[PDB]
Design a protein around this ligand. Structure first.
Ligand SMILES: [Zn+2]
Ligand SMILES: [Zn+2]
Lengths: 91, 127, 63, 214, 202, 97, 25
RNA sequence: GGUGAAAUUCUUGGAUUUAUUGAAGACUAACUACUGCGAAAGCAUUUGCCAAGGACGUUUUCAUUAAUCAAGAACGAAAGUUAGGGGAUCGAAGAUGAUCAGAUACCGUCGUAGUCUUAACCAUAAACUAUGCCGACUAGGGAUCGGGUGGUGUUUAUGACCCACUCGGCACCUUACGAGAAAUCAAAGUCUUUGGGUUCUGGGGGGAGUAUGGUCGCAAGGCUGAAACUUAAAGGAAUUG
């Protein structure tokens, strides 16, 4: 029983605002509300009180992360860069 | 007791120039191009003009009093012709003719790996 | 004043637009045993004395 | 305007003591004027030279060496071995068609507080009583010889500071070690190392610096 | 409230007296609660801890960098920026930093700065979608919204515009002496069209 | 009409190989189609070894040699090298000279 | 001519002919 | 600098080159071939992990479980679209300098999108071997990749090289008894001395992959598709000029 075809979650808005706008909002809001997995808690119970933070329910160990994702590609690549730099300066 | 310099010749297309320097290469001495000796804008790559400039370069080097030289030829190199210029031989000829010892010859045109797509497009430079 | 002298010994071939450039593998008389290829204009016989203003210059082909 | 050739001082270098004749180069800096003069001007002119003039022979006409200066004293200095690299002639003289190529590269920290990145190079010659044109490997042979070459090369590191490693490399005993270790695979070709490079000069160490003269 | 970047409560132990001093760092990306943090010159390099940029190698990536030693943070705090260091001149201990989308600056080597990109990236891409969210947003900052135009507005509110028609009749491209008084509409705008205007073009 | 036996070049069971540019004309061609030759002549003009030996220590030193590889494009190759065509049957030969 | 530019002309003419149908219907 | 020649641009605020370096990305040059792998499109750095592959060996195992295929699906070069990363190089548009009767074209210098990556689309090509898949038979010959078997063979007891044979593969030279209009074909042969199983496609050229419907796609467009309507040839191979 498919409740709709192409609009999915963002169909609440109805006819207003246009097509590309609410489509972009869909593609961002699914990531915004997705349930990821905290690395040092094992389970997947991350929720949001506000943007910028991701709070794991069990373990209560929150993380100050991206705007709509646990890790942006910029974060993922600069972490690797700093890793390379630390290894170079140390070893 | 022979004092050493380094020629470091650049022999590309449409011109050619040289400059003697110390063994480390930090202080270039006497830089001369074809334009220094001829003004026609076509024969800048002429080996005759190359030898005419190499003679003056050798004279200015002997003024300081240099004896032995390490010659290191380099074409345009990179993603270009990969071929030394026409004056690349007349330069050596006139330099050895103008009273100066040569030793330890080598080429240093830096061969690259495949990268940085050359110009001309897929169809290449067509007349 | 490099007014050099050289004796054409062996006519090599002929080039030029009109075929009017005679090549030669000449060697200059004073301190001989040093050879260079020159390109004279007019006809040149064997053992032909000749003068040169240039000290060194090679130009094989000429159309 | 000023004619700058008469505004420099003719200098000389001094190779380390683990070689033959050392008075091998002479350069220019500046006159003994004011505003930071030659005593503290260059302090870091890297210089190239082949091994022919450094060993006295000529069979070492390739594998040129690059040397670095650091300290100056008494119108003299003393340089430390920075690295080496083949002549471009021998590379394209050796490489030819209808054969293979093998390479490897490892970055290591020596016994002392230095680092070094080392390269390798090898080919595959056809032996006697052979009629083929190519004499290629089987792609597992290359994988085996690569790792065994890497480890047998690394065994010389972790021990033998670069000082004694220079005199270990000069007679090229490591190539004979490679031959003895890998003769079970192929009839081998001329094995070389072709490149050492450094990127962590740890500190000055004026003691070990000045330990190479007399 | 207001600032879209989150922040974190940090606590150190005072060295001069028995006391636990709390402070408010800006929450960079990758840090988690219950985490140990370092500060000073002799600190290592793991994302979150603060160092002086004079004693870190070439090519790091930092945020909340200081402009003069003692300002206690004064550059690049917003959600979606950082800064890279390029130069290292120990004599007259300055250092060149590349604010890579608008400037190349020189700063004293002892200035402060924390490694790690600032959190809240990609925030602006989300469209507002309606006036209510814009209203609520500017509520927790300023009374500079809803904007209203001036040129199209009446002549008393803008002398170079208004009336029956929507006329302009002024000029925008001002010389090097950008005087004041005509500060309505444009100011010292010269070029047009969006292209790669900088050094090292492509 | 199918002119040559092999369709274009030595390519059976690969479909696609790899492109590569010319040095003279800079045309883009498959790596297998055009030309692949070497230049291993000398680093010298008309003799001059007398001059080199007389004006250099280390007599002759190395016997120097130049090294290059050439990939002439289809049109530039026939333009420079003046051979180009062959008989209706002579094309089948594969002699280097 | 070449089938390339033939197809190009015809495909542009297709859009041109279908353009007026939108304004009509 | 740069071109056939010059011009544009830079140039005592040190020009391209020249030594220490330090940054961003693109890729794996020579090795590199009548070689390999993959259903194709495609696939060249090393190293670890992840599961899959054909050939080879078999005195192992199940016993017709098989070949092809409407309707249904997977994969799909480059360009292009949607929103992020960077933009080094190259570079449709565009801006300029040359040449030219004219040149918004070839040429010279810059230059946006693109040229890679992430998450969704698009399903096209001279997607060529222009030769559909499965299975037998008909000529000779030498190399070559992988697997395997022998040699009172060569080099350190295993690895490597040689000699004979064999299974599979990219292939190649000759000959063509045969076929074909010929170019040519080891299959394009075993065909009027007309039939081993099987899917698809075409009936002169254009109108024409055209609007019409239908269907998929936010879009470039994709799939199926006769007419009314004009005509005498268009077309393939090869011989002589
Ligand atoms: Zn948790
Ligand atoms: Zn070319």
């Amino acid at each position: 029983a498919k409740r709709t075809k192409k609009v999915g979650i963002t169909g609440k808005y109805g006819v207003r605002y246009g097509s590309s706008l609410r489509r972009q909002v869909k593609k961002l809001e699914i990531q915004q509300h997705a349930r990821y997995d905290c690395s040092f808690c094992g389970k997947k119970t991350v929720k949001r009180g506000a943007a910028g933070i991701w709070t794991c329910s069990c373990c209560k160990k929150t993380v100050a992360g991206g705007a709509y994702t646990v890790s942006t590609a910029a974060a993922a690549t600069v972490r690797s860069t700093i890793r390379r730099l630390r290894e170079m300066v140390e070893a | 007791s022979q004092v050493f310099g380094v020629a470091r010749i650049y022999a590309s297309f449409n011109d050619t120039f040289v400059h003697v320097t110390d063994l480390s290469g930090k202080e270039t001495i006497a830089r001369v191009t074809g334009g220094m000796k001829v003004k026609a804008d076509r024969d800048e790559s002429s080996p005759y003009a190359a030898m005419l400039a190499a003679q003056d370069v050798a004279a200015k080097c002997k003024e300081v009093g240099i004896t032995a030289v390490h010659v290191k030829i380099r074409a345009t190199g990179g993603t270009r012709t990969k071929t030394p210029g026409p004056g690349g031989q007349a330069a050596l000829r006139a330099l050895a003719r103008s009273g100066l010892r040569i030793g330890r010859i080598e080429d240093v045109t830096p061969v690259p790996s495949d990268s940085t797509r050359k110009k001309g497009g897929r169809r290449g430079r067509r007349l | 004043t490099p007014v050099t002298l050289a004796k054409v010994i062996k006519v090599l071939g002929r080039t030029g637009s009109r075929g009017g450039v005679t090549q030669v593998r000449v060697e200059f008389l004073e301190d001989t045993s040093r050879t260079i290829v020159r390109n004279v204009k007019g006809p040149v016989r064997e053992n032909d004395i000749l003068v040169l203003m240039e000290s060194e210059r090679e130009a094989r082909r000429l159309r | 305007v000023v004619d700058p050739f008469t505004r420099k001082e003719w200098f000389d270098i001094k190779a380390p003591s683990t070689f033959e004749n050392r008075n091998v180069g002479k350069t220019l800096v500046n006159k003994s004027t004011g505003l930071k003069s030659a005593s503290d001007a260059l302090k870091g002119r890297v210089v190239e030279v082949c091994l022919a003039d450094l060993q006295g022979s000529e069979d070492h006409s390739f594998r040129k060496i690059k040397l670095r200066v650091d300290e100056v004293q008494g119108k003299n200095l003393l340089t430390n071995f920075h690295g080496m690299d083949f002549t471009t002639d021998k590379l394209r003289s050796m490489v030819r068609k209808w054969q293979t190529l093998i390479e490897a590269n490892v970055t290591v920290k020596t016994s002392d507080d230095y680092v070094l990145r080392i390269f390798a190079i090898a080919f595959t010659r056809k032996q006697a009583n052979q009629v083929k044109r190519h004499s290629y490997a089987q792609s597992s042979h290359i994988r085996a010889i690569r790792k065994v070459i890497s480890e047998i090369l690394t065994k010389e590191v972790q021990g033998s500071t670069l000082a004694q490693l220079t005199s270990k490399l000069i007679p090229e005993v490591i190539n004979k070690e490679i031959e003895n270790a890998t003769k079970d695979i192929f009839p081998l070709q001329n094995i070389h190392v072709r490149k050492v490079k450094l990127l962590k000069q740890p500190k000055f160490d004026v003691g070990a610096l000045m330990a190479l003269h007399g | 409230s207001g600032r879209g970047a989150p922040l974190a409560k940090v606590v150190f132990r005072d060295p001069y007296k028995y006391r636990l001093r709390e402070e408010i760092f800006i929450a960079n990306e990758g840090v988690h609660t219950g985490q140990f943090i370092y500060a000073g010159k002799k600190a290592s390099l793991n994302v979150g801890n603060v160092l002086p940029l004079g004693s870190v190698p070439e090519g790091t990536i930092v945020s909340n960098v200081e402009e003069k030693p003692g300002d206690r943070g004064a550059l690049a705090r917003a959600s979606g920026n950082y800064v890279i260091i390029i130069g290292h001149n120990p004599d007259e201990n300055k250092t060149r930093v590349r604010l890579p989308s608008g400037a190349k600056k020189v700063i004293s080597s002892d200035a402060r700065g924390v490694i790690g990109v600032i959190a809240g990236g990609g925030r602006v891409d989300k469209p507002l979608l309606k006036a209510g969210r814009a209203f609520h947003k500017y509520r927790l900052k300023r009374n500079s919204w809803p904007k209203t135009r001036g040129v199209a507005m009446n002549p008393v509110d803008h002398p170079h515009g208004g009336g029956n028609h929507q006329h302009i009749g002024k000029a925008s491209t001002i010389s090097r002496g950008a005087v004041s008084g005509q500060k309505a509409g444009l100011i010292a705008a010269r070029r047009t069209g969006l292209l790669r205007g900088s050094q090292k073009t492509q | 009409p199918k002119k040559r036996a092999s369709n274009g070049r030595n390519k059976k069971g690969r479909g696609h190989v790899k492109p590569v540019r010319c040095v003279n004309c800079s045309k883009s061609i498959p790596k297998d189609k055009a030309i692949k030759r070497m230049a291993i002549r000398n680093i010298v003009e008309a003799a001059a070894v007398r001059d080199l030996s007389e004006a250099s220590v280390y007599p002759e030193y190395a016997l120097p040699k130049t090294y290059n590889k050439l990939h002439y494009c289809v049109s530039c190759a026939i333009h420079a090298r003046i051979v180009r065509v062959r008989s209706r049957e002579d094309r089948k030969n594969r002699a280097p000279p | 001519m070449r089938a390339k530019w033939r197809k190009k002309r015809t495909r542009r003419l297709k859009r041109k002919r279908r353009k007026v149908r939108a304004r009509s219907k």
